[PDB]
């Protein structure tokens, strides 16, 4: 599976996940921030559209932007260090933000979902603590998407 192939797939898995999530004040345009170095975010940085027609606007922002929490609805988190990671999740505390990381190491440190972009399919894990404190509602059937992503 090539990088273009995986990036495209990451896009559709992210749409999949978004469809199980609700924000307390649903915006007309869903804002996505890509934070830190990423390999697979070029597809989602094109912008996306959800099944109901709501647009997902994407852009990159710096790790140390203190207003990440009010600047977006969704965070796609790349490869950052301990300090940077702390920085980011302290910015998000108390705000209704969905967090997904590109690598599956981050479910232990604050990300709600962590992708494993490797093998034949994009799979992901989730973290209940981070989900519970996130300020958004995640429907538990989101794990249907994950389960089906093996085989």
Numbering used by the authors: 39 to 189
What's the paper's own text on this?
The crystal structure of YfiR was determined to 2.40 Å resolution and reveals two molecules in an asymmetric unit, with each molecule traced in continuous electron density from Arg38 at the N-terminus to Thr189 at the C-terminus. The two-fold symmetrical dimer is formed by several key interactions, including salt-bridges by Asp80 and Arg98 and main chain hydrogen bonding between Thr76 of each monomer. YfiR crystallizes as a dimer and features two pairs of conserved cysteine residues; Cys71-Cys110 are in a reduced state while Cys145-Cys152 form a disulfide bond. Two highly conserved pairs of cysteine residues were identified in the structure, Cys71-Cys110 and Cys145-Cys152, with only the latter pair confirmed to form a disulfide bond from the electron density. Mapping the conservation scores for each amino acid onto the YfiR structure reveals a large, continuous, highly conserved region on the surface of the protein formed by the C-terminal helices α3, α4 and the α3-α4 loop, with contributions from strand β7, the N-terminal helix α1 and the α1-β1 loop. The structure of P. aeruginosa YfiR was determined by single-wavelength anomalous dispersion from a Se-Met derivative protein using the AutoSol module in PHENIX with 2.25 Å data collected at the peak wavelength.
The third component of the YfiBNR signalling system, YfiR, has a key role in the signal transduction process by bridging YfiN in the inner membrane and YfiB in the outer membrane. YfiB can release the repression of YfiN by sequestering YfiR at the outer membrane, which requires both membrane anchoring and peptidoglycan binding by YfiB for full activity.
